Automatic annotation (TrEMBL), chains A, B, C, D:
Protein name: beta-lactamase
NCBIfam families xrefs: bla_class_B_core, bla_subclass_B3, blaL1
Disulfide bonds: 216-244
Names of required cofactors: Zn(2+)
Compartments where located: Periplasm
Binding site for Cu(2+) 1: 82, 84, 158
């Protein structure tokens, strides 16, 4: 009996179902798929991309940027929620084709440079082309493009580098404080006494409190279902979206239930 | 219609068919699979590994090292023919589990650090966990472990970093100059006017001449079939093996035929 | 008037004054200089080095290891307090000459890979040869060599990656819990409203509390004066050494005074 | 007697003597110092910089770009002759402040990522802030910005990664084939039997022939004196400049004389 074949990272079809740009606020657009968020923020001096989704989405993102009037070279900066294959997948290829810089904290930088390999929980099961961060970000640091200020809020747990990004856009007239909060799932993770992540539970617990305190007129998440968006319904997409408070509290109830189950079995 | 799923790198079963250590000379053993070479050289001051095969072979290699009396921490150095998934696949994991250093030329180092992504010919189709080289090697440089001297001979073409490694072992008494020459295939490559590799044909042509001039009492290749080894027949494995001259000349005839076919269609 | 010349990183002579190995406990030795700590821990299966001091100390460290019976290849692992030139200076050269692996957290890893350049407070004024970390460590993770367990305790502030390392040695018979706590200085730092380190004050404040809670029968610090060691007096070197509590409290009083002075002027 | 202090990399004052932009052709300007070349090429879709000189020149270069109408964000690409402190010195800082990408061959990439440390001949004596290459270039590859095509010609010797860059500009009307050829010095190098560079002499010899064959209506070199430019005399700066043939032949005569002297003593 030979050694087993490598097994591809396959996802639900809706994670790979392309959509046209969906306007979130005056400068902010969802340009990823129906089930993976990729936010384009268009400024007077270039564009910012927050997340890119799966590795095979690079061309779709560039197509949607062009629909928005954004040439590849106009992308100045890539920001990330966390460096897993379904959110940072196409970053290497996007950098090559745009000249964009990547800004991320040290934890996200080292995982991205590994292509998601040697993941604390997934091992080498879910990888993607490696990419290097060009600017290292600290907790609370402000990154500014075209006058739009993006603030990082560290929320470790789902990954050590998990980050929420906040910025204030407008809706026609009035300001809208947008919060792009990272995932709070723990899919198949060993939570208690994890030798690769000894303070995992403490980090999640603090991250729930960080999410609750975010400036947050409008919450978005890497998976739209996590904050109750429906990208397929256009102008009704945000209607049932959760607050940052409700997102944190639902995530913590799920976490507490999984911890109790882990303690049981 | 959604975007396509990622597709795993699958190979012939014999590339993943484990074998027990096969002795090549007094200190040198084939410890990979029936169809992928991985050479262990055991010295008074630790072991050297030349190639590791596929990513999922790391545990098999460590098992065979232990059969040879070589504990994981006793592996001092990893050398590579070239940094493709089926030859350098398990290098990252081997480094983590042994403390070995990797020595390679600059071209092999940059490809390895990318996990084989953005390959000049394969793109992102065939990747593996990224790894960093700890020592950069120049053409003709000598690497010595436990008194055994390994000499690098650059033979670019199959990859820009393709390298032949030579060393002198013994067979009971008499010296045997071993040549571990890299692959000379060009699988699906565009050879002529390649914008990612403008001097590809010149490099292959020079590499044929480098292989012909190697010190070479015994030739081995990353794929045993390439030099006419049969690892499944034990002490008869090397009986029909090619000389370095015959390997180079057969590879150049194949190359010339493919170039003429490329020129035709 | 031409642009100014580059200016070397010069230190007090005692930071570069070599000393013979000074035994701290049964397996632990100070092998750096009179004014820079470099701890060698010798185990049944190889040695661990915690810090190396200045870049030009590599040969002195190897000389002292040899005096201890430790050949260069016997060094298995390098640990760091923080990645500044006077503590991590010779790490690159030590790795090349020993085959050791470096283990560090993500923050220390990214600063080390920059050679201390683009430092949040020093800019490019104080740099050293870059080095890569081979294993990324999480808060509370245990690294074990030869049965001796080293636990990391993150204490950000002096650098984002600042780390205390703890292990239990023996003194003849009885156990001694050693705490190698990092520096808590803020030399010339802007503490309040620092755009490169927005949560600097919160991190220092938490790090004082982390240091107070360390398992700590014997405290050592990267600069011996910081914990009131005198490496020049041999067996009396530790006599007046501070507890972890006193070190934290003295450091916090200094920090509070500097913050008040920063608030004033 | 203590260990010696670190010693700064100091150069002649004229290597740090700033100058205003000196026009070389319709799109090409010398914007470095009187004694260090840094070429700005201005295109319809952004600027290219070839070399930057010393680390402390970053601000001077940005000042000269602004004089040319080139904002920091308008710099798209940095190209290098070779990755030594006096030519690639400010690359890290320029990348941070412009968003430019660096393109270089694998040898130049690995040396740049080391900040020039562990240099084959200089060791750690001459270092600079490390920087990463964003695009790896092959021999003869064409890099295009704003329709202007830059071709790389490898000329190893001074460093393994030494590269000549060629492009065709215009002088008012007529085309001018510019050749920016790298240094061919061997300052204090051991040429014969160098274990860190065994094929050094063969590489230099081939590089003389590469330089002789360059498309070359106008030659420039990293040090203007090497090709007999005088940047201080404005429109007469290129009057006595050497051809590519004469540069190669003078460099080879110097090399041959140094080799004979090395063979003697
Ligand atoms: C298993 C996932 C997937 C993996 C991950 O990022 O952890 C990815 C590697 O495949 N992405 C994930 C994430 O939280 O970001 C996870 S969890 C899953 C995603 N949508 C679902 C959701 O959020 N609901 C509220 C139902 C659960
Ligand atoms: C297509 C391959 C495979 C790929 C490669 O390394 O290029 C790998 C990525 O899947 N390894 C390869 C190599 O030359 O190293 C190639 S060529 C193929 C391997 N054994 C065969 C062989 O060498 N014969 C003499 C029949 C041809
Ligand atoms: C300015 C330093 C020097 C610099 C640093 O590491 O920050 C280095 C870059 O030069 N190392 C330093 C450290 O805290 O680690 C600092 S502080 C200085 C060192 N010994 C002194 C001390 O600790 N006392 C209790 C008097 C103060
Ligand atoms: C010793 C140098 C200096 C060093 C180098 O790059 O090698 C640098 C590290 O300090 N740069 C150098 C180079 O060739 O690029 C060298 S050689 C020196 C520079 N101008 C002179 C010259 O080229 N003449 C024709 C007189 C000789
Ligand atoms: Zn995830
Ligand atoms: Zn996800
Ligand atoms: Zn291959
Ligand atoms: Zn192969
Ligand atoms: Zn410090
Ligand atoms: Zn210090
Ligand atoms: Zn040079
Ligand atoms: Zn120079």
């Amino acid at each position: 009996a030979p050694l087993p074949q490598l097994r591809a990272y396959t996802v639900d079809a809706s994670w790979l179902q392309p959509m046209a740009p969906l306007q979130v606020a005056d400068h902010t657009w969802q340009i990823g798929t129906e089930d993976l968020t990729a936010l384009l923020v268009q400024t007077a001096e270039g564009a910012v991309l927050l997340d890119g989704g799966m590795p095979q989405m690079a061309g779709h993102l560039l197509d949607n940027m062009k629909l928005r009037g954004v040439a590849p070279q106009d992308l100045r900066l890539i920001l990330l929620s966390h460096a897993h294959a379904d959110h940072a997948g196409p970053v290497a290829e996007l950098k090559r084709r745009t000249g964009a810089h990547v800004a991320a904290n040290a934890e996200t930088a080292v995982l991205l440079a590994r292509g998601g390999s040697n993941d604390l929980h997934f091992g080498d099961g879910i990888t993607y082309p490696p990419a290097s961060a060009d600017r290292i970000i600290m907790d609370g640091e402000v990154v500014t493009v075209g006058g739009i200020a993006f603030t990082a809020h560290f929320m470790p747990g789902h990954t050590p580098g998990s980050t929420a990004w906040t910025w204030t856009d407008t809706r026609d007239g009035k300001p809208v404080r947008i919060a792009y909060a990272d995932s709070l799932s723990a899919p198949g993770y060993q939570l208690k006494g994890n030798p690769r992540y000894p303070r995992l539970i403490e980090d999640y617990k603090r991250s729930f409190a960080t999410v609750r305190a975010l400036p947050c007129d409008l919450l978005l998440t890497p998976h739209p279902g996590a904050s109750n968006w429906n990208y397929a319904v256009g102008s009704k997409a945000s209607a049932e979206a959760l607050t940052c408070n409700a997102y944190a509290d639902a995530a913590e109830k799920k976490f507490d239930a999984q911890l109790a189950r882990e303690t049981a079995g």
